[PDB]
Design a protein around this nucleic acid. Structure first.
Lengths: 214, 91, 25, 153, 81, 127, 97, 97
RNA sequence: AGGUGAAAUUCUUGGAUUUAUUGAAGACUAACUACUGCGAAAGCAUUUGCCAAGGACGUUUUCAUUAAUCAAGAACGAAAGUUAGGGGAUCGAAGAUGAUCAGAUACCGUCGUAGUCUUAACCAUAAACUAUGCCGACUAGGGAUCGGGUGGUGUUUUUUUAAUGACCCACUCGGCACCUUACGAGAAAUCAAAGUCUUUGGGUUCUGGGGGGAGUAUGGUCGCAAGGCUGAAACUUAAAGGAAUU
């Protein structure tokens, strides 16, 4: 027995400058020991949370922005965008029945030559005339959704890295870009980009390390 | 006059040793002897020039493949993986 | 008696009749 | 002639003297007498080439690698055998790798790792047939054959 | 059922069903006489056509292959028959 | 401005994992399972088990001082019953019945592609 | 003897399609020829629902849901689940209740 | 489609199969096409690449084979370089590539 | 902790169960997944390039009897089982056993080799099912449902009357199942086929005959074997089988 409460430093964590409120939540690393200071302790930790409590509108009480602690600044762990995800709980909530699920994937590189991969989820709905209880597609139309989802995604990216790409992810401007070309074809309900993952990032760069401090 | 029903280039091993043994023999024997396609020309005219090599008569460049087959079941799933890493670090 | 149990009882005594049959090869 | 795979005289006109010393990079089931190879921590991940594991990835297969960065190649030198990687670490360079002894050992991310396995698709999977290819077999190894029985003498 | 007269037909069942189930085979389609703005000669064409029918000197493709009737451009005149 | 974190409590069959962690996840806070109060095992994922479960974690979270927690409960997920603990939700009935600000209620039970064979087969586990 | 149209369950002119094992006694059987029911479970239950909203942080919150899909084995699904053995022409029944 | 273009112009077009003839057609001034696939030595084609800029001719590097580029020329024999001389039917001078 | 109805096994001071950061082989393609698809059958559900194919209908298209279904024969053939290269992620014949009862080989527990899938090739079999043959015309209505043709300054859209896509409307051939009775038929069950069979014949592939014995003896042909198609007879016995009813 040692009651670790002592070496259980009730630390804290916040957000960068790409969002709104630089407040995410408190944590608990470990008291500064011998050859294990309170700077290079973990740093590989992460911050998984819905961007609703991360911003200020309960409309986004869905979708979970994925972050990963970089290092400590002001005895307050910073953070950075490692990717975007969709709540597993809201995934089964948007699935009704008698329909068709249209999904797609695509690997893309940014200007900073960052390796990530934006996807896109899609559910089906009827029309203001149709009587059909299904609203399926001739497949050759759902197959056209994949060549158009990747078209859109890989046509705007490859610039300003995910710093400006994530600056359009949160305000869900893609929900009106997907429903933009689809307006001249099929209606579709929900319509979101769902997931995207990043894993090809160099090492600790002090450059964008102070671009998170503001 | 094919002097075989189920022996082929193994009948040269008569009744000695055993059937089971000689059976598998003919397998990779054929997948070594046969003028293997040289991907360094796309023209198949390269046989087995000693254990693990394929002497090519199409630019005369000897080839590094398999002990019998030009690519075993093992070094096959491996042909894939090295390709995978290549791109991730490429661009 | 199940038909699969009766079908195998005789399948074993049929492969067994190939044994006492090997006494004539 | 005496092993079981195409070992090549890998030429180097010497990075400090003008004399071509054909060094030696073992067998690779996927090469040819005429490849523009590159060796050194700053080369491409093309088979035949090589760089220390501080320039390679998690789950790679290569040969004639040093357990001690310089041995010129210890592990990964067999007809039909390879070496994959089971882990890594940027600091301390402790990249865990897959060796067929049923276990795995840790190396440093500075050891020379030459891309590709040793050539020889399925040898112990194509019988001697007769002690003939078996006598001419121990011919380029050692007179440990024939092996008698203990209960005997 | 009971009694009718498949000897004397009606105009309703003449513009609804397939000529292959009525009493005699006959095309429900037709041809057309469509011209282009600048042709002072003649131009006789088909209906669905399938293959795209071109022009004379200013070949600007009159129509293209459609599942329906070979669609015409903004420089043509849909002339029925 | 609150003392954030993530509950990430679990509740399978024959046990109920009643403990909380931090938003990072690479650091937990308390464990305390329900069978630790009951010495019979007959009733493991039972009702009073979860009550006494969030009882041993109730005063321990009062020691850290964390209250605002983004809970991420689970059933069993993976490839088993895929059904939440029968009396394991009685843990929420006792932690709220004592005090603990809850918000951002969600789940993270991963559903498979029926990939790895399930434990049953054709004829299944008929008793 | 034979009492049902597509005997199994919507099994007509195809054969082996794509099966899904039972999510109860682990009894495997085809998805398009078995039985399945959607699960609309909220987040908690019907009793302690009020006590959780009282402690809920943020203005009453939005409160999302967690749905699911069921798969039954037939044998156990009849033990005392959804069925209760039905009548003749009431067998053709394809209506919700 | 790259299939339609090839089929037609090769069943009614003036061509030249081979290094010498490609060099002869090059040192004539009536060759505008020379497609070599990835498997044939681009070294012989290196002089053809050093001659691509010298011949000023618009080359094309087909991602395939000269045994699949053999179906393109006509006989199941071996031909790495397809050098077009005079137009005979189609004009791949401007295609979807 | 894993676990059952509760146990015991087992993993646990050698820190497993526990949440988080990259991984990996092997496996899968979930939820939408349907009285629906397309494919010769068997079946086969993520994306894209390539290869080409089949198809509904479009057509005032070309042929001119091309034709129509099969003994011996000829291609694929799920899955078990196979010879061997890659292959055990889980589950998991067998096995190992902890409970159970008088007993348990088994059901329920944990682990666990063959197996699990692949490369080119074997065994060619199943409730391979629609227990119900292929095609050419007819006897009924509505449509559930898809591919398709038409007209609509029809619904939705705004960029800009054009180009417009999708939805709506009767109709609607080739498809996929259902409903009402049955004109008919059927032992009944039930069936738009089991109608068009005493009022029995439109061309045709195949097999069955009271049941045991017994798909077993023999042999031929196939295959490595297990075993496949195969196919007795004596003797015995007056019941057996099916529908449907009480």
């Amino acid at each position: 027995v040692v009651d670790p409460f002592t070496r259980k430093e009730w630390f804290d964590i916040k957000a960068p400058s790409t969002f709104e409120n630089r407040n995410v939540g408190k944590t608990l690393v470990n008291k500064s020991t011998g050859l294990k200071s309170a700077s290079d302790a973990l740093k590989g930790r992460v911050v998984e949370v819905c961007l609703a409590d991360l911003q200020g509108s309960e409309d986004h009480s869905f979708r979970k922005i994925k972050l990963r602690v970089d290092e400590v600044q002001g005895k307050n762990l910073l953070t950075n965008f490692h990717g975007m995800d969709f709540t597993t709980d809201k995934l089964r909530s948007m699935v009704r029945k008698w329909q068709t699920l249209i999904e797609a994937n695509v690997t893309v590189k940014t200007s900073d030559d960052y390796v990530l991969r934006i996807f896109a989820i899609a559910f089906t709905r009827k029309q203001a005339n149709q009587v059909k209880r299904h609203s399926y597609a001739q497949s050759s139309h759902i197959r056209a959704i994949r060549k158009v989802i990747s078209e859109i995604l890989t046509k705007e990216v490859q610039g300003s890295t995910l710093a400006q790409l994530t600056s359009k992810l949160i305000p869900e401007v893609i929900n009106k870009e997907i429903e933009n070309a689809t307006k001249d074809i099929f209606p579709l309900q929900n319509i979101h980009v769902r997931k995207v993952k990043l894993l090809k990032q160099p090492k600790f760069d002090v450059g964008a390390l102070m671009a998170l401090h503001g | 006059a094919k002097r075989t029903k189920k022996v082929g280039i193994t009948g040269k091993y008569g009744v000695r040793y055993g059937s089971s043994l000689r059976r598998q023999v003919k397998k990779l024997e054929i997948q070594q002897h046969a003028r293997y396609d040289c991907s360094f020309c796309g023209k198949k005219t390269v046989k087995r020039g000693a254990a693990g090599i394929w002497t090519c008569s199409c630019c005369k460049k000897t080839v590094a493949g398999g002990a019998y087959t030009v690519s075993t079941a093992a070094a096959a799933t491996v042909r894939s993986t090295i390709r995978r890493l290549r791109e991730m670090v490429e661009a | 008696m199940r038909a699969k149990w009766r079908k195998k009882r005789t399948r074993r005594l049929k492969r067994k009749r190939r044994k006492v049959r090997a006494r004539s090869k | 002639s005496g092993r079981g795979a195409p070992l090549a005289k890998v030429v180097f006109r010497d990075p400090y003297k003008y004399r071509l010393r054909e060094e030696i990079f073992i067998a690779n089931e996927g090469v040819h007498t005429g490849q523009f190879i590159y060796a050194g921590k700053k080369a491409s991940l093309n088979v035949g080439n090589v760089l220390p594991l501080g320039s390679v990835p998690e789950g790679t297969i290569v040969s004639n690698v040093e357990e001690k960065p310089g041995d010129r190649g210890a592990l990964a030198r067999a007809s039909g055998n390879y070496v994959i990687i089971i882990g890594h670490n940027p600091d301390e360079n402790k990249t865990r790798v897959r060796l067929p002894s049923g276990a795995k050992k840790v190396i440093s991310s500075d050891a020379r790792g030459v891309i590709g396995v040793i050539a020889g698709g399925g040898r112990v999977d194509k019988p001697l047939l007769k002690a003939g290819r078996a006598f001419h077999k121990y011919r380029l190894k050692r007179n440990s054959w024939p092996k008698t029985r203990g209960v005997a003498m | 059922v009971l009694v009718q007269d498949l000897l004397h037909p009606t105009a309703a069942s003449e513009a609804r069903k397939h000529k292959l189930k009525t009493l005699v085979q006959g095309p429900r389609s037709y041809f057309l006489d469509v011209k282009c703005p600048g042709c002072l000669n003649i131009t006789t064409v088909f209906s669905h056509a399938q293959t795209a029918v071109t022009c004379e000197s200013c070949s600007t493709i009159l129509c293209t292959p459609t599942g329906g009737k070979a669609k015409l451009s903004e420089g043509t005149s849909f002339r029925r028959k | 401005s609150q003392v954030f974190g993530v509950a990430r409590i679990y509740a399978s069959f024959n046990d109920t994992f009643v403990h909380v962690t931090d938003l990072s996840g690479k650091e937990t806070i308390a464990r305390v399972t329900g069978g630790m109060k009951v010495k019979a095992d007959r009733d493991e994922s039972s009702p009073y088990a979860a009550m006494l479960a969030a009882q041993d974690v109730a005063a321990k979270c009062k020691e850290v001082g964390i209250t605002a927690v983004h809970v991420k409960i689970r059933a069993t997920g993976g490839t088993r019953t895929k059904t939440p603990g029968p009396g394991g939700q009685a843990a929420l009935r006792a932690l709220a019945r004592s005090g603990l600000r809850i918000g951002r209620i969600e789940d993270v039970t991963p559903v498979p592609s029926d990939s790895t064979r399930k434990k049953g087969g054709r004829r299944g586990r008929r008793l | 003897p034979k009492k049902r149209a597509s005997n199994g369950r919507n099994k007509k002119g195809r054969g082996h399609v794509k099966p899904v094992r039972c999510v109860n006694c682990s009894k495997s059987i085809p998805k398009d020829k078995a039985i399945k029911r959607m699960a609309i479970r909220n987040i908690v239950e019907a009793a302690a629902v009020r006590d959780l909203s009282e402690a809920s942080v943020y203005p009453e919150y939005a409160l999302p849901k967690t749905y699911n899909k069921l798969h039954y084995c037939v044998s156990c699904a009849i033990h005392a689940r959804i069925v209760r053995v039905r009548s003749r022409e009431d067998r053709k029944n394809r209506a919700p209740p | 489609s790259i299939n339609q273009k090839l089929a037609l112009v090769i069943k009614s077009g003036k061509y030249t199969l081979g290094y010498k003839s490609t060099v002869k057609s090059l040192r004539q001034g009536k060759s505008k096409l020379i497609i070599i696939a990835a498997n044939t030595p681009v070294l012989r084609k290196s002089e053809l690449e050093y001659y691509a800029m010298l011949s000023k001719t618009k080359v094309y590097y087909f991602q395939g084979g000269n045994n699949e580029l053999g179906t393109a020329v006509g006989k199941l024999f071996r031909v790495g370089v397809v050098s077009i001389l005079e137009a005979g039917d189609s004009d791949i001078l401007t295609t979807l590539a």
